[PDB]
Amino acid sequence: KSYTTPKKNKHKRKKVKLAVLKYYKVDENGKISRLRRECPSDECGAGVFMASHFDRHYCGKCCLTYCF
Amino acid sequence: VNTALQEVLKTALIHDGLARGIREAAKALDKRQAHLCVLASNCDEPMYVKLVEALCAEHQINLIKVDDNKKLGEWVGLCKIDREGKPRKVVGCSCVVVKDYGKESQAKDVIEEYFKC
Numbered sequence: 001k002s003y004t005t006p007k008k009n010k011h012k013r014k015k016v017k018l019a020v021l022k023y024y025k026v027d028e029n030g031k032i033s034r035l036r037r038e039c040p041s042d043e044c045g046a047g048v049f050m051a052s053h054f055d056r057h058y059c060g061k062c063c064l065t066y067c068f
Numbered sequence: 069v070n071t072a073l074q075e076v077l078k079t080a081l082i083h084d085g086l087a088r089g090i091r092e093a094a095k096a097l098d099k100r101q102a103h104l105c106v107l108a109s110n111c112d113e114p115m116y117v118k119l120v121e122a123l124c125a126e127h128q129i130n131l132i133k134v135d136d137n138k139k140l141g142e143w144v145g146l147c148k149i150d151r152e153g154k155p156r157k158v159v160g161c162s163c164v165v166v167k168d169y170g171k172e173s174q175a176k177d178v179i180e181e182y183f184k185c
C-alpha cells in the first residue's frame with residue numbers, strides 16, 4: 001500500500017509499433033539492406049542484430065560490448 | 069491443394085517443423101533453413117504486403133496465398149482450446165516458415181512435385 005516512502009515504479013517497456021518492419025529497407029528491388037551490424041559470435045545467432053545507440057552498438061543475450 | 073496445406077501444417081505441428089512469427093520467419097530466412105513459406109494477400113494490411121513480398125521472394129520459395137489473416141491461426145493452433153466448437157480468441161499471422169523435416173509421406177512427394185514446377 002501507499003506508505004511514507006514512495007515506491008519507484010517498474011520499468012514499463014513502451015509498446016513500439018512497426019519495429020519488425022524497421023529492420024530492412026524497402027526498395028524497388030527485392031534485396032535486403034539492414035541498418036544494424038550483424039553478430040559474428042556464436043552466442044547470438046546470425047539473424048540477431050545489435051542495438052541502435054548514439055555511439056556504440058550492443059548485443060542482446062551475448063552481453064558483449066564492441067567499441068570502435 | 070487446401071487439404072494438402074492442412075496435412076502439411078499438421079505434420080509440421082507434429083514434427084515441430086514450424087516457426088511462428090514474421091521475425092522468426094526472417095531469422096529462418098537469414099539462417100538459410102527455409103523450405104515452405106505461406107503468405108496472405110488481399111487482406112487488411114496497408115504496407116506489410118510489399119515488405120513480405122520483398123522478403124519472401126528471395127530464393128527457392130513456393131508461394132501459397134491466404135485470403136484472410138485471422139483465419140490462418142486456426143490451422144496452426146495459436147489458441148487451440150475447446151476443440152468441440154470454436155476457440156475463443158486467435159490472433160492472425162502473416163508468414164510462418166515451414167521447417168518440415170518429414171519428406172517421406174503419402175502426399176509429401178505429391179506436393180513436392182507440385183512445388184517443383
Ligand SMILES: [Zn+2]
Pocket residue numbers: 039041043044059060061062063064
Ligand atoms: Zn552478440
